[PDB]
From a paper:
We have been investigating the function of an (ab)2 type OFOR from the hyperthermophilic archaeon [name] strain 7 (StOFOR1), which is composed of a 70 kDa a-subunit ([name], corresponding to fusion domains III-I-II) and a 34 kDa b-subunit ([name], corresponding to domain VI). StOFOR1 shows broad substrate specificity toward 2-oxoacids, such as pyruvate, 2-oxobutyrate, and 2-oxoglutarate, suggesting that it has multiple roles in glycolysis, gluconeogenesis, the tricarboxylic acid cycle, and amino acid metabolism. However, the very low reproducibility of single crystal formation prevented phase determination and further crystallographic analyses. The StOFOR1 structure was solved by molecular replacement using the StOFOR2 structure as a search model. Superimposition of the StOFOR1 and StOFOR2 structures indicates that they have almost identical active sites. In StOFOR1, mutations at Lys49b and Leu123b, which correspond to Ile843 and Asn996 in DaPFOR, affected the substrate specificity. The K49bR and L123bN mutants exhibited strong preferences for pyruvate and 2-oxoglutarate, respectively.
In archaea, early branching bacteria, and amitochondrial eukaryotes, the reactions are catalyzed by a much simpler enzyme, 2-oxoacid:ferredoxin oxidoreductase (OFOR). The TPP molecules of StOFORs accompany a Mg2+ ion around their pyrophosphate group and are buried at the interface between the a-subunits and b-subunits.
Residue numbers in the entry:
A (entry chain A): 1 to 152, 168 to 194, 206 to 218, 225 to 420, 426 to 435, 442 to 515, 518 to 536, 540 to 624
B (entry chain D): 17 to 44, 55 to 117, 147 to 195, 212 to 246, 249 to 304
C (entry chain B): 5 to 53, 56 to 136, 145 to 208, 212 to 248, 250 to 304
D (entry chain C): 2 to 42, 45 to 99, 108 to 116, 126 to 135, 137 to 155, 165 to 193, 210 to 218, 227 to 423, ...
């Protein structure tokens, strides 16, 4: 049984804590949560909301439709009234407000809600929206947060908690271990452990992944989805390390540097990696575009480095606070001149944690940059994760730094521990500059061979995941995977690509071989995964479900697009 | 060029630094390791090398166009961190390296002539030895600040900084051409020292020496990181 | 005309915005020719304005954008607004290079102490200890770079700011006004509340170069004044119109430049290319 | 077709010598394709040219006549020499990584060449003393080999004056000298570029240096005939980030703006490219492809950068990409690129291999000559919304000073104000992307492709080598792709449809052009001929590898 909750509010007014309190308390009672924050590129005044799904079963997504809307202001009501299906908690003290009254709302939004409501047609007030709600079976609940404010946020979540019918002693704990309920508890009545579980967002899963994985140098430039990853790492930079064969604890430091720009950031991390440290940076689209020169030098000098690339809305500045899946072909082929890159993409919070470690291991084994794609939805979404036996692969460490081999991988010494030469210019086995034609052909080959070796040593089955099984295939990557797995619990084969370079060519050909319908599902315009699939397999997808509006895929909307593809047809469905 | 490089070997020898811990970073021997970086980026690379292994001695060699043109943002940013390393500069309008270095500041700032190589070599020894970020602008009329009545560019008390800055800036507008040390202020802590004060283990077990792995097993412990996240 | 301003209640930018609008009205400039070029950030969201054109740039790149606009059409009146992170971190290179060039435009720095829009990380003007990095000295760096009109102002003295902005525009060459803007959301220190005095008060304060022999002496006085902080001067620290602008240096070379600017040249007539190539091709006949 | 090489140390008049020879031989009425090969400095360089009756677009590994003055040049080239080998007698007994391999592969080298080459020693040192009382090896030199050709000394005296003979006996339309840089420079000047910004980088500086030298420009009117004096502003930026950003700034003004860079540089311009795409700004980048990655081989060539430039930047936005094949096309494409930029209101990358930049040839006037301007959907004024929703995605374009407008890198509404509105985002993103679809219907597929004979699929410089392989030996259809975005997918697919062998030829390890071909058509190539050593494709070497592909059925031929 899955329940949709939404709390809305103006950015800066309480919130966060209201959703993290409610969310903690529902989770402490053994229920599963998937929560997501939607907010403007703004610090105060704009409308933000938190959508949570509540379920008895693990859950991986949110819906357009809402079952419980908690609202303290008037903007929230207008922003959401149309999507509520069951209950709408509102402030009675803002029942009179007109649309024209609301300064915060983007004018383009204000018009649509104005007519809507004029056709239909109700007053174009809050009342008007509330009154629409009633004739679509929504149970209104008036609230007087003013009356309560002087007779003595929390009141809003407490009402909606009572609607569930759970034990008040979790809310309390939830309210005590963080920093009224006597009154608000009794205005409406009820209407509806196993293992360790952790609260994680994508940022924290990656950050913990990097700490555990051996990252001891991290450089970054503040950029919205990824300054939280660093900061978290900086806050826990003093770390303990213990081996079994002595048992001795030894304290270490992760240097975290706030760089002047993204060029500097990548260049410091590359610099760090020559020393033997595991090194990483974190950025988003605008910053990745600046790092490409650095990625080239790292490719050229066979430097391990991981870049965590959070994908936000683009191009350019784009939508700083919103998500997309726009950046696939670009990171795969980023840089002039040809060089091995490994490219990995997580589809959920746990995978975020594990891929970060895997990415470190691959960097070090194939001595090459590794890009780890995480959509910004994963970074700002959070969830109750059960226990999801993981090792280090430092690769071929120990003089010619670029000595030829048949697998392309030269034994690696670190600065201080051997005399070495590095250069961006084409170079011989000693690392000196060499325009010689035979060295050139051989050395360019050797870098390029590393990826053919990765192509063999990484089994194709570890580069994908498979769910369901049927005559109607769906290919995707990243966060919609979660959305589609939740759909499989109620009435196709689901293939999630994980590694795009080296790409699992043959397994994807094989898996497409006997179907009526092949559907790509992804948040972009060009349908970039289909272009990759066609590049490597020669084969075409039959249909696409696409979305580029800055919003993640939602469980109900994607279900209506599947039906509209599968039962009905149409090549190309664009989500609204 | 041939002479600047020579003067760097000899200062290293004379201060008795271990050649296996010297890295020379430049833009676009004995057994000294060299890192030929990208255009205008040597300082960012150097910063990364030095902060992972503070036991290294990191010299940045750059051209006038390399640093101070394409690299001018790394130049002023470096002045904010005060990383213990040395920047040797091998010298529409033109800019004043000294003034820009003091204004962005840059806690050792000097000028050498490309021959006198003796004098340059003693400047380079001062820079390395200096605790913090040193810059030597090297030119390829000339006189030595060293040979004036009471020329003392060293700050020794917090109250002297203003007077020392004012005198350095005045001397950097002379063009009589001064060479020598214009300003030295070791009361400003190193970037490494600033890391120490918050993360005290840093210097005695550096990121480059930390064993994050024993025979394939990750030695870091995260349980307290995972406990704070428990439902 | 509708476009909503989402600055936090209390934000020095409301002041910069007001001084800047007023600066242009009073100065009687054809608004048709004003272009405000802004970097990324909170400060970047100006306009927000009066029918002025606005070019919202990339982070750190305003000065490069503004230079292309200006040299293609020198009739325009190009103002740049950027943040401290913008102009002095990621854009510091563009900042130093611009003083070599001396293009006629105004650069207005939103001295915030923080990366506001990205949730408050220390900017390059935050002092160590507030934070592991030093602050740069904007005015001193501008003078060294440098940079032919320099000044500081306060966002909560619109009057004084409006008159700085005006004489910066009137100034023929590259002007810098450094503006101290508080950030109640993220700068707990440097509130307001948090001292300010005006240089223009002092008995004999003369920042203008009259003759080129007094260049070095005016510089030295501007550097001294750039060093006071704690118990803070404000006004015009230095000015020198003897330095030729970049546009004057293009003329001493291309007389026809300022008469027939790149933006006004007609390369086409009814889709027929007007440019004469014949001597270029003639000099290469076999 | 004859194959001439002069070689020796840099800054030793070997370039002027080559210039003169080539002027002389060309003014007689023959065609030249020349190219220079050199290291990043003292070191050794040589000039290789081919002399022929008809248009020539390639060079050969093998050398008919070799002029040489030192031991180095003999050592470098003896293995490739077929007919004549002029050498200095004073170096006959000189002893020696390239050197290591030559130790088993000067006297000994002539020993080798004899067994079979005619061997011309020269008393260079002696000839020069006889010019006295009356760097002169160079002239004879070019004189010995010129009489070898059996052409009248009158033409070679002409050439010397606008800047021995009998030692040996004789063995054997309006036109322009264009290199790739010069051809682009002149395209841009003619095309209306009034603002070029750049950062110095090996292959591309020469272009901007030519534009600045000719910045004083003269414009007519077809009607009145009234000539007017203009000026091209050329700015040397502080870095490549500044370079694109200045150009973009200038384009908002209405001027045609451009820049020129090479690989390292292009990587730095990716952010600016995204802003231009987001804001629908015309701007062209001339992208000189050189040996990479990173710093790579600054003096060398490649075709390594194709998919990257097509897919550079971090969201989705339209960009047009165009690839020149010879020196004449370089001049045409610069102009086409400007017009495309302005018509579709988007960045255009004009790809030009380094081989074409520095190489030069004798080009016949009928190239051509017909070139027009297209300024697109452009208004004088000035209620106006810059990004007005339109069916073809192309909003009417006003210029700064002529209208109140707002530009931003954030997503925006029709006014250019920031909007995070769900409906606006969907509509506005679609609008930018539509322009590519409109470019695909409106640019005829036959213009984005060049077909010779009637399958080899290629682009750029190897196209000219493959055309020169359509007389010698009884050999194919040659398909040159010219525009990669929007790609001519329907025509390339149709053209791939009725054959046994589809070969791809390109200077890449990855055979990127096959990858692209497969992405848009689903069809695979049967074989591939590749090279990544920083050297152009040569007529002979490529002939022999083509045989391997066709006779022996070798799938992936690598040219070492
Ligand atoms: C639209 C919001 C956004 O994405 C921002 S806002 C922002 C603001 C930096 O602060 P500032 O001191 O220049 O402006 P303030 O907000 O006025 O303090 C950055 C660094 N960014 C991220 C960013 C980082 N690096 C590059 C290259 N581009 C970016 N947009
Ligand atoms: S954050 Fe500081 S700067 Fe950005 S708006 Fe709110 S207050 Fe003004
Ligand atoms: Mg700021």
């Amino acid at each position: 049984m899955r329940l949709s909750w939404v709390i809305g509010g103006a950015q800066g007014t309480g919130i966060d804590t209201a959703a993290n309190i409610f969310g903690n308390a529902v989770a402490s009672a053994g229920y599963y949560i998937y929560g997501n924050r939607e907010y403007y590129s703004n610090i105060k005044g704009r409308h933000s909301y938190f959508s949570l799904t509540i379920s008895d079963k693990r859950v991986r997504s949110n819906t357009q439709k809402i079952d419980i809307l908690v609202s303290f202001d008037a903007e929230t009501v207008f922003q959401h009234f149309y999507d509520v299906k069951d209950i709408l908690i509102y402030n009675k003290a803002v029942e009179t407000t007109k649309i024209d009254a609301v300064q915060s709302m983007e004018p383009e939004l204000a018009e649509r809600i104005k007519d809507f409501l004029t056709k239909q047609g109700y007053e174009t007030t809050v009342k008007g929206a509330l009154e629409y709600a009633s004739k679509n079976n929504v149970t209104l609940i008036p609230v007087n947060y003013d009356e309560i404010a002087k007779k003595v946020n929390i009141v809003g979540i407490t009402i909606s908690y009572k609607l569930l019918g759970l034990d008040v002693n979790y809310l309390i704990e939830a309210i005590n271990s963080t920093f009224a309920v006597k009154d608000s508890y009794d205005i409406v009545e009820s209407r509806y452990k196993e293992r360790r579980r952790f609260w994680l967002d994508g940022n924290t899963a990656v950050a913990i992944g990097k700490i555990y994985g051996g990252v001891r140098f991290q450089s970054y430039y503040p950029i919205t989805p990824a300054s939280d990853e660093s900061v978290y790492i900086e806050a826990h930079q003093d770390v303990l390390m213990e081996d079994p064969i002595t048992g001795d604890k030894k304290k270490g430091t992760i240097v975290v540097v706030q760089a002047e720009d993204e060029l500097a950031a990548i260049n410091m991390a590359i610099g760090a990696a020559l020393t033997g440290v595991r090194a990483a940076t974190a950025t988003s689209g605008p910053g990745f575009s600046l790092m490409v020169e650095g990625l080239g030098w790292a490719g050229m000098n066979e430097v391990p480095v991981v870049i965590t690339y959070y994908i936000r809305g683009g191009p350019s500045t784009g939508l700083p606070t919103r998500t997309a899946q726009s950046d696939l072909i670009f990171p795969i082929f980023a840089g002039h001149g040809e060089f091995p890159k490994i490219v990995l993409a997580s589809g959920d919070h746990a995978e975020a944690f594990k891929d970060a470690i895997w990415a470190l291991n691959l960097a070090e084994k194939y001595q090459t940059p590794v890009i780890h794609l995480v959509e910004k939805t994963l970074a700002n979404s959070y969830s109750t994760i059960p226990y999801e036996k993981l090792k280090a692969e430092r690769g071929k460490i120990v003089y010619k730094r670029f000595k030829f081999t048949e697998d392309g991988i030269s034994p690696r010494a670190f600065l201080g521990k051997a005399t070495m030469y590095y250069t961006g210019d084409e170079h011989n086995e000693e690392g000196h500059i060499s325009e010689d034609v035979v060295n050139r052909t051989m050395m360019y080959e050797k870098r390029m061979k590393k990826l053919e070796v990765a192509d063999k040593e990484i089994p194709e089955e570890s580069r994908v995941k498979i769910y369901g099984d049927l005559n109607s295939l769906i290919i995707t990557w990243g966060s919609p995977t979660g959305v589609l797995r939740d759909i499989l619990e109620e009435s196709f084969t689901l293939l999630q690509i994980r590694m795009f370079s080296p790409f699992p060519k043959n397994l994807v050909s094989k898996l497409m071989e006997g179907r009526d319908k092949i559907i790509t599902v992804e948040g972009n315009y060009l349908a970039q995964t289909s272009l990759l699939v066609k590049m490597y397999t020669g084969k075409d997808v039959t249909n696409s479900i696409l979305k580029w509006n800055g919003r993640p895929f939602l469980r109900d909307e994607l279900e209506e697009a599947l039906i509209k593809v599968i039962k009905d047809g149409e090549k190309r469905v664009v989500l609204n | 060029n041939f002479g600047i490089l020579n003067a760097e070997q000899q200062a290293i020898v004379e201060l008795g630094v271990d050649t296996k811990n010297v890295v020379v970073v430049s833009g676009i021997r004995t057994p000294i390791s060299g890192v030929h970086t990208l255009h205008g980026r040597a300082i960012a690379f150097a910063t990364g090398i030095k902060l992972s292994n503070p036991d290294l001695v990191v010299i940045v060699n750059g051209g006038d166009g390399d640093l101070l043109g394409i690299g001018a943002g790394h130049f002023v940013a470096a002045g904010r961190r005060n990383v213990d390393m040395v920047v040797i500069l091998h010298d529409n309008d033109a800019v004043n390296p000294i003034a820009l270095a003091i204004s962005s500041g840059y806690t050792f700032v000097a000028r050498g002539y490309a021959y006198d190589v003796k004098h340059l070599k003693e400047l380079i020894k001062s820079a390395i030895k200096h605790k913090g970020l040193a810059l030597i602008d090297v030119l390829q009329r000339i006189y030595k600040l060293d040979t004036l009545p009471d020329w003392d560019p060293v700050v020794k008390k917090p109250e002297e900084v203003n007077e020392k800055i004012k005198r350095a800036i005045d001397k950097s507008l002379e063009w009589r051409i001064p060479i020598g040390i214009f300003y030295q202020n070791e009361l400003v802590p190193s970037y490494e020292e600033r890391i120490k004060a918050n993360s005290p283990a840093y210097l005695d077990y550096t990121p480059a020496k930390q064993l994050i792995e024993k025979e394939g097993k990750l030695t870091t412990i995260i349980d307290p990181l995972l406990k704070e996240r428990e439902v």
